[PDB]
Design an enzyme around this catalytic site. Structure first.
Site, PDB file in Angstrom:
ATOM      1  N   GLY B  56       0.797  -1.217   0.000  1.00 48.87           N
ATOM      2  CA  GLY B  56       0.000   0.000   0.000  1.00 48.87           C
ATOM      3  C   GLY B  56       0.831   1.269   0.000  1.00 48.87           C
ATOM      4  O   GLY B  56       0.979   1.935   1.027  1.00 48.87           O
ATOM      5  N   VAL B  61       3.986   8.663   1.643  1.00 46.42           N
ATOM      6  CA  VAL B  61       4.306   9.235   2.949  1.00 46.42           C
ATOM      7  C   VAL B  61       5.014   8.196   3.823  1.00 46.42           C
ATOM      8  O   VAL B  61       6.138   8.420   4.293  1.00 46.42           O
ATOM      9  CB  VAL B  61       3.030   9.790   3.612  1.00 46.42           C
ATOM     10  N   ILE B  81      -1.945  -1.245  -5.959  1.00 45.49           N
ATOM     11  CA  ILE B  81      -2.833  -1.620  -7.047  1.00 45.49           C
ATOM     12  C   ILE B  81      -3.087  -0.452  -7.999  1.00 45.49           C
ATOM     13  O   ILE B  81      -3.547  -0.675  -9.127  1.00 45.49           O
ATOM     14  CB  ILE B  81      -4.136  -2.170  -6.440  1.00 45.49           C
ATOM     15  N   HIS B 154      -0.442  -1.560  10.038  1.00 48.33           N
ATOM     16  CA  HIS B 154      -1.181  -0.343  10.346  1.00 48.33           C
ATOM     17  C   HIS B 154      -2.692  -0.602  10.295  1.00 48.33           C
ATOM     18  O   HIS B 154      -3.157  -1.549   9.661  1.00 48.33           O
ATOM     19  CB  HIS B 154      -0.793   0.776   9.377  1.00 48.33           C
TER      20      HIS B 154
HETATM   21  C1  SAM Z   1      -3.923   3.860   3.376  1.00 48.48           C
HETATM   22  S1  SAM Z   1      -3.395   3.976   1.636  1.00 48.48           S
HETATM   23  C2  SAM Z   1      -1.609   3.769   1.824  1.00 48.48           C
HETATM   24  C3  SAM Z   1      -0.946   4.943   2.521  1.00 48.48           C
HETATM   25  C4  SAM Z   1       0.556   4.780   2.674  1.00 48.48           C
HETATM   26  N1  SAM Z   1       0.885   3.520   3.341  1.00 48.48           N
HETATM   27  C5  SAM Z   1       1.132   5.963   3.443  1.00 48.48           C
HETATM   28  O1  SAM Z   1       1.132   5.989   4.679  1.00 48.48           O
HETATM   29  O2  SAM Z   1       1.624   6.907   2.828  1.00 48.48           O
HETATM   30  C6  SAM Z   1      -3.895   2.325   1.044  1.00 48.48           C
HETATM   31  C7  SAM Z   1      -3.281   1.974  -0.322  1.00 48.48           C
HETATM   32  O3  SAM Z   1      -3.453   0.596  -0.606  1.00 48.48           O
HETATM   33  C8  SAM Z   1      -3.799   0.421  -1.970  1.00 48.48           C
HETATM   34  N2  SAM Z   1      -4.480  -0.887  -2.131  1.00 48.48           N
HETATM   35  C9  SAM Z   1      -5.778  -1.243  -1.878  1.00 48.48           C
HETATM   36  N3  SAM Z   1      -5.917  -2.562  -2.158  1.00 48.48           N
HETATM   37  C10 SAM Z   1      -4.725  -3.051  -2.583  1.00 48.48           C
HETATM   38  C11 SAM Z   1      -4.305  -4.311  -2.997  1.00 48.48           C
HETATM   39  N4  SAM Z   1      -5.141  -5.348  -3.027  1.00 48.48           N
HETATM   40  N5  SAM Z   1      -2.994  -4.493  -3.359  1.00 48.48           N
HETATM   41  C12 SAM Z   1      -2.101  -3.436  -3.332  1.00 48.48           C
HETATM   42  N6  SAM Z   1      -2.525  -2.175  -2.946  1.00 48.48           N
HETATM   43  C13 SAM Z   1      -3.817  -2.002  -2.562  1.00 48.48           C
HETATM   44  C14 SAM Z   1      -4.567   1.675  -2.364  1.00 48.48           C
HETATM   45  O4  SAM Z   1      -4.405   1.994  -3.738  1.00 48.48           O
HETATM   46  C15 SAM Z   1      -3.918   2.741  -1.487  1.00 48.48           C
HETATM   47  O5  SAM Z   1      -2.908   3.407  -2.217  1.00 48.48           O
END
Ligand code: SAM
Ligand code: SAM
Lengths: 198, 198
Positions: B56, B61, B81, B154
């Site tokens: 993710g 950040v 994704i 998280h």
């Molecule tokens: C909470 S945000 C991540 C924020 C990041 N970790 C930060 O603190 O800067 C969740 C992320 O997970 C991604 N996501 C959702 N489902 C996913 C999957 N099955 N595989 C990979 N990424 C996924 C979304 O596109 C999004 O960018």
């Protein structure tokens, strides 16, 4: 706040730890919360867990948690000004089955003891005695840390002109401005400041 | 609660991180709090910081914070994704001066990507995508950890019958019952569950 209560309430303790806590309240000595203890165990394990120094043994609650994250051959050196607290801690370590060669208990003022311990020889230094002395403990503690060691200060978050609060902030200042340290504050118990040395 | 606000308020961020946060809110992607970021940096540094995997990426950040605790030669492999989020994260890494060989960005579903990464080859695995998928990420994440590595989840503290809350507790269960893991819950941001492998 609900986040914090959820974390504090995450951990249950065995009967030995319960015995140690009972003894801590009798002698009027503090004791870290179970969730702080779990964090100390994690950090000892991350730190390598071979030589750990503790300032403020109490009745051994923090020491039991640290020992559960240290190596079998690891040595917890713990320091208390009160021989009575050391005796209670030694009893708890014994009840837990801790081999006598895994603990080294030292009676005395930690401001003097720490100076006698060898520089860059410790994987984790845990500071949990009087907060007003935190600045001295941090200066000496950091010197004991090998590369990749962790210093951990309890009661890190404790009137903004009090002599004790001046010392706590002054110690947080010492860590925040030390280029050799990578720190994070953790809101568990009375507040835990941890920092890894370079 | 005052303890928690004091911790969250302990950290200030540079202009690059501020730019990354701005982009995160535009695309509606979450971002860990600064105090969570400081913790991720500490844990990456404790973990050895040579190979770190992130599930993710968001707008980068968390990745910027992880990279500040990794070695110069370290490689952050981060998975999202959404190619648009990856593009924004890559921009932030570029603005921070991160050498291109220190990041490996992978577009795809992390349930599939993680299976392709090499077992016991990673110092830290950070899980921050959808909570409903936390159980799959933990099973795969733990396998990637070398001895002494850390898995970090998280949103670990998030009706008690919701499909998403079932998954979060089920993942906390997986970690709590894994004899190879030493865990601690940390009440920062949305809640951080960290656990060291044996
Ligand atoms: C909470 S945000 C991540 C924020 C990041 N970790 C930060 O603190 O800067 C969740 C992320 O997970 C991604 N996501 C959702 N489902 C996913 C999957 N099955 N595989 C990979 N990424 C996924 C979304 O596109 C999004 O960018
Ligand atoms: C908060 S209690 C320690 C609790 C213990 N860390 C635990 O969690 O189980 C503080 C301890 O520091 C000791 N102490 C106070 N001043 C000291 C000093 N100058 N040098 C060494 N120990 C001191 C007290 O005797 C007391 O046992």
């Amino acid at each position: 706040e609900s986040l914090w209560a959820h974390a504090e309430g995450s951990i249950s303790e065995d009967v030995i730890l319960a015995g140690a806590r009972e003894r801590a309240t009798d002698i009027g000595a503090g004791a870290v919360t179970p969730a702080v203890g779990a964090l100390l165990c994690l950090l000892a394990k991350l730190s390598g867990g071979k030589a750990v120094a503790e300032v403020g043994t109490g009745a051994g609650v923090s020491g039991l948690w640290l020992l559960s994250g240290m190596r079998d051959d690891g040595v917890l050196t713990t320091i208390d000004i009160e021989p009575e607290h050391l005796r209670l801690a030694r009893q708890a370590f014994a009840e837990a089955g801790i081999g006598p060669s895994r603990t080294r208990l030292i009676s005395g003022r930690a401001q003097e003891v720490l100076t006698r311990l060898a520089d860059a020889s410790y994987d984790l230094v845990f500071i949990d005695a009087d907060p007003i002395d935190q600045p001295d403990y941090v200066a000496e503690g950091v010197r004991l840390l090998r590369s990749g060691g962790v210093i951990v200060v309890h009661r890190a978050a404790l009137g903004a002109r009090d002599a004790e609060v001046i010392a706590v902030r002054e110690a947080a200042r010492l860590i925040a401005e030390d280029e050799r340290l990578t720190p994070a504050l953790v809101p568990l118990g009375d507040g835990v400041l941890a920092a890894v040395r370079d």
